[PDB]
Write a protein that holds these residues in place. Structure first.
Motif, mmCIF file in Angstrom:
data_model
loop_
_atom_site.group_PDB
_atom_site.id
_atom_site.type_symbol
_atom_site.label_atom_id
_atom_site.label_comp_id
_atom_site.label_asym_id
_atom_site.label_seq_id
_atom_site.Cartn_x
_atom_site.Cartn_y
_atom_site.Cartn_z
ATOM 1 N N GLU A 1 -5.197 36.776 57.256
ATOM 2 C CA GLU A 1 -3.835 36.661 57.438
ATOM 3 C C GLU A 1 -3.072 38.043 57.130
ATOM 4 O O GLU A 1 -2.566 38.282 56.189
ATOM 5 N N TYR A 4 2.078 37.315 57.773
ATOM 6 C CA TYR A 4 3.228 37.010 56.923
ATOM 7 C C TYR A 4 3.352 37.866 55.775
ATOM 8 O O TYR A 4 3.704 37.249 54.619
ATOM 9 N N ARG A 21 -20.641 72.161 28.819
ATOM 10 C CA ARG A 21 -19.930 73.429 28.734
ATOM 11 C C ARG A 21 -20.464 74.092 27.499
ATOM 12 O O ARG A 21 -21.156 73.734 26.822
ATOM 13 N N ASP A 22 -20.071 75.508 27.357
ATOM 14 C CA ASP A 22 -20.447 76.507 26.528
ATOM 15 C C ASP A 22 -19.158 76.341 25.371
ATOM 16 O O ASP A 22 -18.740 75.583 25.220
ATOM 17 N N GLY A 23 -19.399 77.497 24.447
ATOM 18 C CA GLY A 23 -18.598 77.438 23.375
ATOM 19 C C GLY A 23 -17.281 77.047 23.221
ATOM 20 O O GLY A 23 -16.684 77.191 24.306
ATOM 21 N N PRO A 24 -16.830 76.224 22.263
ATOM 22 C CA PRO A 24 -15.547 75.388 22.313
ATOM 23 C C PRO A 24 -14.391 76.063 22.365
ATOM 24 O O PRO A 24 -14.263 77.141 22.021
ATOM 25 N N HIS A 25 -13.350 75.551 22.537
ATOM 26 C CA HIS A 25 -11.862 75.649 22.457
ATOM 27 C C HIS A 25 -10.915 74.716 23.389
ATOM 28 O O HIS A 25 -11.399 73.780 23.937
ATOM 29 N N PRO A 26 -9.819 74.416 22.865
ATOM 30 C CA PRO A 26 -9.028 73.288 23.317
ATOM 31 C C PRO A 26 -8.517 73.370 24.646
ATOM 32 O O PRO A 26 -8.066 74.405 25.262
ATOM 33 N N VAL A 27 -8.884 72.251 25.445
ATOM 34 C CA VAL A 27 -8.745 72.447 26.804
ATOM 35 C C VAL A 27 -7.569 71.360 27.396
ATOM 36 O O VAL A 27 -7.026 71.707 28.285
ATOM 37 N N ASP A 28 -7.440 70.232 26.631
ATOM 38 C CA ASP A 28 -6.886 68.941 27.149
ATOM 39 C C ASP A 28 -7.268 68.559 28.437
ATOM 40 O O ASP A 28 -6.834 68.578 29.644
#
Lengths: 48, 258, 48, 48, 241
Positions: A1, A4, A21-28
């Motif tokens: 249908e 309607y 990933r490699d060595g860290p950091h803040p990414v959000d």
């Protein structure tokens, strides 16, 4: 249908590519994509 | 342990505006006072009025230095959470957006200033009608030049605007002045005479080439506050780890409090 | 009044025992029969 | 306010809890400090 | 809240003569342009400072160091380097330092860098590759004003320092090439006011040239378990910011 009704939006989602990933950091890191689309209705006929 | 503010939006107006201001993440506000709660009528232009009159660009500059630095990241389905950036000590790199039309690299020194360039996104409200103002976020150099170029007309509005970078030549606006802008020229009558002294009479003798040690030590100290006392103070700085070296106007950045 | 493309099913019902009898048979017939009852109550009421 | 043509009879709802208008603990009659929360009554401020 | 660590490149097939000097230089202070986990050793040398034929002027080098980040070095792993990056707020590492200064220093005071204008012998002359890296000094912020004011007062006439009881007495000449006229311009502006296209010079150059010498303090010294006062060349712990 498909008769309607008024309108219909079918939405979806897909994952976002981020390999290990490699060595860290803040990414959000993101949350989603959530695109949307529409519907466009037509019709035809024939004479006999 | 970061100090947090709540600017929850009550349930009067339609979600068509909170959905529209969802796109304003990484924008920078600055709260007049401090407490563990706030609202819309307190960080709006209605909160920035004086004498019922809208302050001008100058009167909107001396007031910003009295409010407290804050950034936004989340517009909750019911509320909105912002961090106190002026004094708070957040270990995250506070994500902000570069709305001002100036391209970004890694290592700017970003500052805050009022309505400029030509067009912005100052959004109103329909039901309660509250106008919130967003200090455009720029770097420090072009601000050190705009302060010169605004005093440059201040010394005409009482006594009687296109800047270049990256090949771009854009204007800066300044409405009719109030006679108080008294406030403006006093800043130099203080900032000039103390930068010259008795030890500066030797100075006019070495000019055809193109105790004084004391006058060099004091002159630089005041020289650092001519832009600080007459302008704004940078609060954050760009530090991108694994992104692009070309951060454009209108894009989110990851900066950290200075 | 009853709008068309809803009276399209009420003019005649080419549905010959549709497999899904709860889709467009309930939420239409009941919704309209409410007013088909209220119009009877109209004359039942207007006499007093 | 543009709702003055968005309604016909709004008189009723717009006289309940219009916020306070003056100082509430001052030694004189000051202007309302912006951090006021009181949503009080005012008959006159409706009929003038 | 975990720290940040950077890994740098090092040459291969080297001499056991300079490598000892590398193993002696632990705790010095160096600046970095962009925080990248993959940044070469040439990235942090004078070679990656603005070479325009000559090394970049130490004025612009100070401007960079104010715009560049920094890194404190700890124990080196003879195969590679391992240094803790600073300037951002890295969470709770055991920051210590080797004090790169010939003047005495007290505990509980502040530290900020300045262009090295005395000697570059404390660098590593790796003539096996042909590229040199140059390192700064360290001084308390309560004295930097005087450190620049004394040298500019000496250089204006041609063209003492003390702390805790220490009596000590190209890019140095180009600093006044943008400085001398900004005060004569104030002498003239006092009379000029009591035009418009001239305003863009005085205010702007004052705001550009006052701040670079009015830097902030990014390092305090603090020893909880050990020596209290330091003389040139010791291992004192510190606190970030």
């Amino acid at each position: 249908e498909l008769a309607y009704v008024r309108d219909g939006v079918i939405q979806f989602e897909v994952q976002q590519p981020m390999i290990a990933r490699d060595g860290p950091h803040p990414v959000d890191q993101p949350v989603h994509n959530y695109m949307v689309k529409r519907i466009h209705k037509r019709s035809l006929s024939a004479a006999f | 342990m970061p100090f947090e503010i709540e600017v929850l939006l009550p349930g009067e107006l339609s979600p068509a505006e909170t959905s529209a201001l969802q796109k304003c993440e990484g924008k920078i506000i600055t709260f007049s006072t401090l407490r563990h709660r706030a609202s819309l009528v307190d960080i709006a232009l209605s909160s920035y009025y004086i004498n019922g009159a809208p302050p001008d660009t100058l009167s909107l500059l001396e007031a910003y230095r009295m409010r407290f630095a804050a950034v936004i990241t989340r517009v909750i389905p019911g509320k909105l959470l912002a961090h106190a950036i002026g004094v708070g000590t957040p270990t995250p790199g506070l994500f902000i957006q570069n709305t001002s039309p100036v391209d970004l690299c890694n290592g700017d020194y970003i500052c805050l200033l009022p309505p400029v360039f030509g067009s912005a996104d100052s959004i109103r409200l329909d039901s309660v009608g509250l106008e919130i103002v967003f200090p455009l976020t720029i770097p420090q150099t072009l601000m050190r030049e705009i302060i010169a170029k605004v005093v440059a007309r201040a010394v005409e509005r009482t006594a009687a605007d296109v800047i270049c970078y990256n090949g771009r030549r854009y204007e800066l606006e300044t409405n009719l002045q109030h006679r108080d802008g008294d406030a403006a020229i006093r800043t130099l009558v203080l900032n000039l005479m103390f930068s010259i002294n008795e030890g500066c009479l030797l100075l006019l003798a070495l000019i055809p080439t193109l105790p004084i040690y004391e006058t060099i030590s004091s002159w630089i100290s005041t020289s650092s506050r001519l832009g600080d006392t007459l302008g704004t103070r940078a609060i954050l700085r760009v530090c991108v780890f694994d992104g692009p070296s070309t951060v454009h106007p209108g894009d989110r950045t990851a900066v950290i409090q200075v | 009044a009853i709008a068309s493309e809803a009276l399209s099913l009420l003019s005649n019902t080419y549905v010959d025992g549709t497999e899904i009898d709860s889709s467009l048979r309930i939420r239409a017939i009941q919704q309209m029969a409410r007013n088909l009852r209220t119009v009877l109550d109209s004359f039942e009421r207007g006499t007093a | 306010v543009n709702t003055n043509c968005n309604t016909l009879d709004r008189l009723l709802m717009e006289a309940k809890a219009v916020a306070s208008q003056s100082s509430t603990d001052t030694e004189y009659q000051f202007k309302r400090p912006p951090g006021s929360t009181e949503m009080t009554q005012d008959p006159c401020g409706l009929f003038q």
